[model samples]
Target: PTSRVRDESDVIGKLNDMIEEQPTDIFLYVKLLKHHVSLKQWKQVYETFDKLHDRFPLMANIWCMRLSLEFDKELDAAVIEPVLARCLSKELGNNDLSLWLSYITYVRKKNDIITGGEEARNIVIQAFQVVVDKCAIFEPKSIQFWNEYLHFLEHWKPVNKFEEQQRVQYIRKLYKTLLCQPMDCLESMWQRYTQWEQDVNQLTARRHIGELSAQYMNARSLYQDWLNITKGLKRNLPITLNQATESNLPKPNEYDVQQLLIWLEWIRWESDNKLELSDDLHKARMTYVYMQAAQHVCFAPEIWFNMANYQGEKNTDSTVITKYLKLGQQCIPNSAVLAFSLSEQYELNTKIPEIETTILSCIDRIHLDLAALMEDDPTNESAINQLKSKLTYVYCVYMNTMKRIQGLAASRKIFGKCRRLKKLVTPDIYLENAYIEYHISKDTKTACKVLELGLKYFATDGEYINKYLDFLIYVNEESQVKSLFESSIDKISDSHLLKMIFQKVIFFESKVGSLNSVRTLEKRFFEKFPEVNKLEEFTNKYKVLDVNYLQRLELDYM
Candidate 1:
């Protein structure tokens, strides 16, 4: 009730006095720190955090906050070191250790002084010791800590001096730890291991190139670093390429690729800032690094499809584009993206016959696998469910790809196959059918019918309603399109979905040459949602031209 008053100073003063009486007033301290931060008062923020740390000396959260605030600034390392040492001396719990570890990671990441040559090595080692000592005490049986600690150790290189002996020792220690320990978390450890191995491989490839090749502008010291990384990799565990693949080890996901890409870009940034590497060599090395990732595990279909597009841009051999598609298919074989890429290449290059052959091959494999899985255990619900979903996706891809190359007959056959692949026809199947009818057959009537069926099954589906309206406009049926859009708009209240409705309305009006209708819809939409239509009235003044008149002027403005 008191919060309704305009003046809060008296209330705040009483609350502050009460907090002072409590002495361990953590909440007040936190609130005050938040206020100081909101006001951007750095000194007050630091002082508040210092007070919290003093009161809760053993509390990891308080230390974490202090470390974060002061990590970027100049602080006496001596002051923070004791806090870390105390946190590490005891058998720390998982959550507290994780928080402290995150703080140490911040120190390593942001402190340039910690990443120095010999000094950086020692700093990183000290950081690892903190993790290992505390972690080993509580979780001696836990391999997770050892694995993470080893990963940090192997990659710990200094700018001034590179100690091969120490690096080898650390690498060997990781191997010993891993070998002696049981695989508690196989998937986790294996993924980390594979990623570390791949990075080592890339480093090796660069080093070998540097050693046997003529002296290049950037390759002078590349070999030495590569050698050091390779020594680390091999010392940890020796494996042939076949052995690597046979291990069936999982790799880390996009984050790992992002990390490598970031490191590469950072090197490029340094070279650019210092003008160390020549333009040609630098560009070539960057290109090489990107290319090295082609067959790497994080092979996104979009990236491969784009690479194929780049090849097409240069008018390179069609086979070069096909090579990317082929490799992409190998990595993510069932991807619709691969289907789109292959279909586009086939259509552009007049390789429809080859595409037809590939589609048949893929369809046959899909059928065989589905049969095998179905036959293995009729009662295996999960297996059957998985196969059904996979087969449905395969059917969709095959149908779309074939429709682009083949005629109505082939598309009809693929559709039948798709229907048989899944027991329940989803909205996606209906959407796919609508697209085929609208674009391939040029039969908007049939497209609308397909959408109606989709709505019958998926009644609440906004996407299908929008697509149906889109097709109506495509066929020049403006009145029906507008009615459908208005009805669909009534069913949803989300502002984002309302934005979609307005977009479709504008799109429909633009198609049918109805400027007045566009203005009415724009005004109604803005009245309901103001932020979207920023210039509400301005959406009106543009005059609409007749389709016939626009077509006539297309050839000659005169």
Candidate 2:
């Protein structure tokens, strides 16, 4: 047998050959460094990293990895400080937050070890000042580095009262600067500043309140300006689905979820806080606002759901909600979420037949859409499988409804229809039917027969094999269980499933069959997965013995 151990000389030779062939491969250099590190070849590791650094000089991750190695081995400050200086001297580290944070972290660690030392404190303070000036102030639009800077200042313990006063004033100045900016997390920064003022015992209540009130007013004005710019020229015209997708629609490329969020905030503000409008006028205004948003964001399901929920809360009629849902479905015909919402509304009104009809209609539409999709892209097996799974879910819902309202026979017919669909229905459909036969109808033989047919259809599916094994075990058919397990080994391709089957068979043989049977199963399991060294892990995981088992002994002499 070939050894699994990696030979360093051979690996190095091959890597050198590969690098000569493709010298520009960044990943090959990374692989070489990784191999050197794994073998603890420090000189080779440094040489590889130097090559990587020279080739990719602007890459911060390479510098980060080199700095990490220095810290890991506790290199001398004399040796590390110049490297740190070189990294900080470059403009490259300004955009890399991880590199800045790592430098600060290393400085903090060094400061922790050097107790009662001024140089250590100065080192940390200098690093902090450099990062704050170069990163936080230079990229004033980025909220992350500013947040970290404020946090560091808030936590840093000053040596004396004068230093403490200076730090507090600096933090307040930073907060004021951040509030005046147009960053993404401006509101959060305002809140954090207010919270910090309230928590700080150094500042008087009068001073805190005076500073906070001015900042609060400034933030509010900034937010109002943003609202004005975002909500440009409010057109009260109702946008149809066709109009929603037209070319002249509002195309604001604002930050993440900012457009939707601004509209929601506007709605909340008008509804909750704006008290000038009369109650009747307020309701009409809110409805108009929702209509405006709904027309533009027609594809957003949450918009429809929220609209329905708002209408329901306002004591609207059930038919009104149903009408809105129908319009929503027209815009998003393939959305299962909207379909389920429609079904829930029908069920809430105790309209059973309407719910059944709605689901059936949805299923039919889904089938047509899937057929069209398959015709356009027949090679998209993943999408085809997803559609098939969705179809199977719809069939299950119909089957359950029929079983509840009609009888076992009606549900059986539905299951039979699904079975005939073959690849359109997953093995889960057969499993569901078999479960009904075994648990609901109390027919063990028929349930076994159903699983038998399922196995024939889904021979390569591990779920079907496992379910069938459970049924056979329940019926005390040990020989049939063994036969099915052995047959499944050839069919299954998944490593996890093969391991599962191996563990189940080996444990079974150890309890009921002879010791020779256990040995044979164990040998075959290793033969199948010879490279795997975790057999004991699986054996311990699946440790079980059948309590009702009666061992059989074979006689060698007559």
Candidate 3:
């Protein structure tokens, strides 16, 4: 094989030598033409293809390739269309698979067929049928073809009675074909079933239920196939009842209320089966079962939320998990677990208002229950402790929400109440209170006192020092700002922190005719934190406008 490769290389070298000496050799020219055409060098390919056809007289593949190139590059296909049609007929050959695929794509794009308008709708149907028929023969194993055909069948709008019957026949045909395939090939059956469920729910027609139920029966059969394969693998996979079937799985009998009852019984059976599993394999099996169950229980929010949480804890984003969490809270308003779960999800997503609403609702319900319990016996220490713990956490959440909302008065009132109750207070709440007083309320004296008291309690926190410096800047108390900056300079080696302090100082100094001092500070600031210089030019350019003089100048100049 190695020697043959070397011989082939020598032959290629000789051919190149011949071509170098005789550039107009027709066969070599045609080969070069095909090469450039394949590379999509349109100008050269066009010129070469013209030359090759002039000499070669009849080469269908060359003509087809040229037609494809023109269409693919979106060149003017008007001149090439007749030639492609001629090649499609007996003059060259019947349409090959690749040629037909290219033609279908071109026709679809050219006619704007996707939106199914008056002219293009029939063309789309014809094109879809052609592809489906072609796939059924030569490419039966192509899942892409099957999926596209199924989608077109499902989505195609029938404009007349003839088309409607044809569409139904097409669907039945595709469903039969899918049923004969391995379960993996029809894995999207559940999604289609869920879509049908939604469609059925919104419909006022009686026939909608029976027709949708038929689709659901097929979906359940597909799911049963999936379960068979799963069991056949002999792996100890935990199977949730919800996972084993879909949301719209057909009831055994249409008018029977016992259908829902039977489904619930099956769920109970599955749950018990899972519970009885050996401890060693349970966790892995449960994880898989949870995910599968979540996908199938699209309408059942509590199950979805639980499954999503299990997945989220395994480092998945599961942003849709928040949707489930929200829905679960709506469905079960008094469920503390649901509310708490939703609160955690909202907090993680940085939706503060949602977190506050859900957690507060949860706390209110808990308080009501605790009150009922205490009414029977007020001196129950254990019950009292539990109630206090719940209320304290609720108070903490309330204070945090108030601080974030800049409700300083409300936060202070709650803080005092929290203090009297002896609830556990984190340093963040105190620091936040100091900030609201400093920035928004502009009570710098109160802010300073708050910080001083906070420092005694939260002395170890870096955030306290930062907020203190910010308070000094707000008051234009440069001396205090300098003192705090100097004290923390070595400890606060963060470049961003240094730039913030430097900018604050430069801002106030520039206000008092200290431009040269400001420039010095700016330079020192950038030296320690080079990123600060990027914005220094803009900051330095912000001179106060002399509006009265500027208005007069504009009037006079005009």
Candidate 4:
């Protein structure tokens, strides 16, 4: 209560003490200024303003506040003009468009007071000229100021025919100046200029169009020039627009991913805009773009995939896709994605024998080559590890294919080989082996044993535990399921997995188990995750089972 009862003098003294310790504290200074203004201490306010200006001259909010204070009292030009002039004289005003816009706004406010008199009109015109000359022309690439300038000129009404003609000519000249420059928003400027011409009266529009046709044509030529320069260019590995130039085009056989994207964008733009071109002509152009991209981006696997997909869409045969894949695989031998694409292409063509041979050969070559390299240098652990991971995937694919085509016996051999491969430690390998036993072989006991072994070997793996529980549930071994759930609660350490297992166990208990089991599971769940409240809601939702009502329901009793 004593802290809450502090007076303005006490607050000011405390803030002043804070300012002394932290002299550059803007918040303290602002607070003091507000306090003085609240107390109607004009002298203190001005002193604070002086200090604030000396320290943070470029702070727009400070100047805006000062101008706002003066403007709130009266429309006195004498009081406001010096502040506006001082703000414009600072170097910050040249770079900060907001400051210039504020000055324009104030000038326009002054114009509003005069009710459209010649003096008012002249002030607005002078202000606009300063913005155009100093800000717009100096910062040619700044579409923001240029856009504002155009918007201002477009909306400002003229008092007479002479001034109206002058305004139109000035707007046209500005548009011409903007069109000739290499600004980022040049396309938007061109679109707005054309739209402006369309909005004008026919007679006036024709007059300007006749004068600006050459400028319009020049803009088109400039865009075409930009396109021509970029179309043939590629650059370094990670190419960017900054690296693209006329003289430094990428050498043949160099890969540039960004350059491929640029070419793709350009081709799409051409296809969208060139509706006058025949369909065949557009197709040929896009095909040429893809060919050029492929030539330079041979080392980029995505480009090869895109090229193959494009050719496939054009009704190109499997032979073309095969050729491209061969070339791509040669360049990117370590890419499993490209290898998979090759397998898919062969499968699509119904070349079954070729598919099997290609996958087998690819897997063998990778294994043998990496083995040879590791044998040459026993410390190349990366190569050995990569080989192991690659073989794991290849073995899974081979096993699945054999199961689909050659029955469980053939697939089991592959699975057994994968299990014996000492380097293969992925849980997926064991999980897939168990799936085969459960589904294909119809061997529940063997599947359970396999999963139990997986749990033993990969004790930390929650997926194995989940699968084991599912297998037991499927086999109706309720005692085993309960035992597994209870044991897994202590073994699994991942919080999310623990919660998932808890939720599953609770669900199983609620569905089929006894009430005592549900209560016990719920208690355990709350003890582990005490902060959670959803368990009560879940318990209430699944508490009662309406077996009689369910039995009374029938689909077609009549």
Top candidate on lDDT is 2
**Least accurate stretch of 10 residues (summed lDDT) in model 4?**
235-244
lDDT of 4 at 451: 67
lDDT of 3 by residue, 46-99 (tens): 665565454322332345455655654454567667655655553222333444
In model 1, state the lDDT of residue 213.
Answer: 36
lDDT by residue (tens digit), candidate 1, 1-558: 122235556544444454443334345555565567667887777666665454434344455655555565556666667656654453222224445465566556645545475665567667666654433322213455666677667665632335655764566455433432223343354445445445546756445333423432223244334334323221111111112231232221121345344434433433342323455444433333333233233235655665556545555576768766765554444455675577667767787777766555445545555565566677887777676655666567667766755666777677765545444434577677777887768887777776665655454566656666656766667676776777777675556765666676775675565778777777787777777545332332222431333334443332
Write down the lDDT that model 4 would get.
Answer: 0.63
Give the Å error, residue 110, model 3.
69
User: Cα deviation in Å at residue 550, candidate 4?
Assistant: 20
Q: Name the better of 1 and 3 by TM-score.
A: 1
Higher-scoring candidate on lDDT, 1 or 4: 4
**lDDT for position 35 in model 3:** 55
TM-score-superior candidate, 2 or 4: 2
- Per-residue CA lDDT of model 2 for 369-485, tens digit only, reads 577558769899888888988888878867776777667898888888887887677777877777788788888777777777876679898866876776666556688789888
Candidate 4: tens digits of C-alpha lDDT, residues 285-390? 4554554455445556777787677666676566778766756555455456677788778778887777667677657656654665565687877777667767
Screening candidate 1 with a backbone cut-off below 3 angstroms (N, C-alpha, C), the clashing residue pairs are 117-160
Please state the error at residue 125 of candidate 1 in Å: 41
Winner on lDDT between 3 and 4 is 4
Better model by lDDT, 2 or 4?
Answer: 2
User: Which is better, 2 or 3, measured by TM-score?
Assistant: 2
Flag regions of model 4 displaced more than 4 Å.
Answer: 1-233, 236-260, 270-284, 315-317, 360-398, 422-425, 436-450, 467-480, 520-558
